Amino acid sequence: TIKDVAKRANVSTTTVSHVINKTRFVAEETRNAVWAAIKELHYSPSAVARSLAVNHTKSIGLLATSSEAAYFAEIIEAVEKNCFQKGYTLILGNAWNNLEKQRAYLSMMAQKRVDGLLVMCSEYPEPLLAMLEEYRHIPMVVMDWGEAKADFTDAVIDNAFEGGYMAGRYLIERGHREIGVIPGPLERNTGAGRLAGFMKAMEEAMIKVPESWIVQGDFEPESGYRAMQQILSQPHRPTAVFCGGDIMAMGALCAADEMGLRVPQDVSLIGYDNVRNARYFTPALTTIHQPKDSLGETAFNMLLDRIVNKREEPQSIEVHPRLIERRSVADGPFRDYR
Amino acid sequence: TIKDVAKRANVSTTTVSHVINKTRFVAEETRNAVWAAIKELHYSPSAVARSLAVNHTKSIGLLATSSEAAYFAEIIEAVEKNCFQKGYTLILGNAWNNLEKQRAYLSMMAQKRVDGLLVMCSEYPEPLLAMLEEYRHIPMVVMDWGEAKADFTDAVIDNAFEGGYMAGRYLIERGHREIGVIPGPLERNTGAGRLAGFMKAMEEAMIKVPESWIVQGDFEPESGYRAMQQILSQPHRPTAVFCGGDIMAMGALCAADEMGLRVPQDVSLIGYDNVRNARYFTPALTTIHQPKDSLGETAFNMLLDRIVNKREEPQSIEVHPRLIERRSVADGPFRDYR
DNA sequence: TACGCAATCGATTGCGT
DNA sequence: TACGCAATCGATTGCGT
Ligand code: HPA
Ligand code: HPA
After folding, report:
1. N or C: which end of chain B has fewer CB within 10 A?
2. DSSP B214
């Protein structure tokens, strides 16, 4: 079709090309003619033809986990914004924590020759670590590790441990000493890391968390429901709960309310994520906020760099959580005594 | 690189190719050699090279609106599943209801030569209608109209009017006659359509909805908050509210609770969407369920058809809403009198 | 029998004149 | 000065032998 254009305008295609990309000077009339031909023919240059010739697709691949979950969804949207903004195209892939799915998506990606790769796989067993190295040639940034687990990628780190600690401290500072916790999968950063930060704050305070008070969630509302229920279902119950993710938390409120428990009058609850609509939870959720957007932009930024400035050295940038006081926490029995 | 392979295996590339695609018979040894070469060289065939030669990219484009919103997010995830499943690649684009953004994304899409297009633009002013026609050559399905607004696309229709009516009736059947409503943007199907279905049920019942009882939302939690508040902020208030979308609804619960209003003891509320976590709203939300997944799969299916079976005629399939009884509705003053 | 030649798909870009 | 020739980017596939 570029031939079709040239001919209509009676110039070579080389010409058509340069005018299309302003890649060299072209006489007005000439330009005009080309433009005209372009219009009638209703021409749209193939980006594939071009990608073949130039050696880059101007498209980036997001190897995600799931995309419905608030947390993820929020990140992804951030990511797309940046792509769009710098003319990149986004290929979204959810491997659902499945190796096969993940091997598959990784292959299509390389095949489709994506300029770079955004990685959000949640859990990283060796085998996954392995595959990724196998593709170290395509530039990539992992967005969900707590620390850099490989020299062949860039990493954006969230300080989930310091976020967990922040959560514990708050409770402690508000008068609590009988706390429970519902963490996310230990196989994840946002899971293991948040817990531990939180646990350090407890040891520091000589607070012991009875194992019947720790219940594993999977970041899903239903998981928060079951755990909360199991915690309050007990003879002896905490006066406060630390829930590893806002969504699971929303599930914890439900249950409490279903047991006719008052939040935060009968139980205080603090989340983690500060998902877009946590403020509208009932009650407005107190939580630790994760800078999801900066988390996306920053990742996209390292990618571009590696891409354009052709950096070779793995890099890593940290981002920081922060506390958001809303209304699910109330003073505890020991407030007055500090 | 395909040359590199051939040579290592001392066969032509034609050979390499057929073995790679099992496109014709190849001697065992031969196959073997090729496979071997493929391995050492660590070969990944360019899908772009191939797309150029075959004339299809095996990738589909989703021209969305936003992707964080529960409703959307849920659809998109459905969509990706199907792509993956039939080997398609997904390009996600959010035009945020912006013509320019939308013209831009549409262009990149054509340029990237996507096999088909999935359309979710929410609002369709003429100008948008115009652009789309300009690309009628690339196959496409609109997923959010209430009726077919063009002969050049396939359409999947949701019966949002019958869903709205379902909502009104429920209330009526539960004893209510003083109702308010918070609809989504009238410029959208899910907005205008739901309202009207709902309004028909009212006229049928000789119920009049005082304009101070209808407050426009934008499907966002904050919008539900403000509206609910404005409704209950009044001297005279309804005993029941019909909220146009679960998320805005979640915002309505918040407000009520903030005004110390009881749900559904002081006010009954019914949503629309049956978003993944409406069951965990506090209280568990009664709502109209939209078959989001079938909505995605069905769309993807029409697309494939047009694509493969090269259909030319616009088609349109309807999907159906249904009621989900949870706990935000309570009997009304007139229950006993029917 | 089993495989290879050469032209094609739509663009870019270094030499030239 | 302002533009064009021809080779290249990585694959497919119809004829042949
Ligand atoms: O893995 C996760 N899933 C869902 N929400 C989350 N918030 C933090 N981590 C996660
Ligand atoms: O346009 C919409 N936006 C968000 N949620 C929705 N649910 C129905 N329609 C919509």
Report:
1. C
2. B
Cα B251 to chain centroid distance, Å, stands at: 21
B338 CA to D8 C1' distance (Å): 82
CATH number of the domain that residue B201 is part of: 3.40.50.2300
Specify which residues A242 forms β-bridges with.
Answer: A181, A270
Alpha helices in chain B (DSSP H): 2-9, 13-21, 28-41, 47-54, 70-85, 99-111, 126-133, 160-173, 194-204, 221-232, 246-258, 292-308
Same domain, residue pair A298 and A153: yes
CA distance A9 to A41: 11
Q: What is the DSSP string of B84-145?
A: HHTT-EEEEEE-TT-HHHHHHHHHHHHHTT-SEEEE--S---HHHHHHHHTTTTS-EEE-S-
Check whether residue A179 and residue A263 sit in a common domain.
yes
Identify the residues whose C-beta falls under 6 Å from ligand 1. Answer: A 69, 71, 122, 184, 188, 190, 219, 245, 273
Element containing residue A91 per DSSP (H, E): strand A89-94
| Closest CA to ligand 2's atom 6 | B71
b/e string for B122-134 if b means 16 or more Cβ within 10 A? bebeeebeeebee
Alpha-carbon dihedral of residues B206, B212, B218, B220, nearest 10 degrees?
-100
Q: Which residue has the tokens 């630790």?
A: A288
Check if the beta carbon of residue B252 is closer than 8 Å to that of residue B269: yes
**Judgement on whether residues A207 and A113 belong to the same structural domain of the protein:** no
Which residues are CB-neighbours of A50 under 8 A, at least 6 positions away? none
* CA B301 – CA A34 distance, rounded (Å): 40
**CA distance to A271, B86, B149, B313, per residue, from B300 (Å):** 37, 10, 19, 16
- Identify whether residues B47 and B81 lie together within a single domain: no
Technique used = X-ray
The amino acid sitting at B23 is T
CA of residue B335 to ligand 2 center, whole Å: 32
Of A145, A106, A155, residue with least CA distance to A122: A145
In terms of residue numbers, what domain contains B214? 160-289+322-338
Residue nearest to atom 4 of ligand 1 (CA): A219
Say whether residue B276 is in contact with chain A using an 8 A CB cutoff.
yes
| Structure tokens belonging to residue A170 | 């708050």
Domains: count for chain B: 3
CA distance B157 to B320: 9
B135 plus B147 within the same structural domain: yes
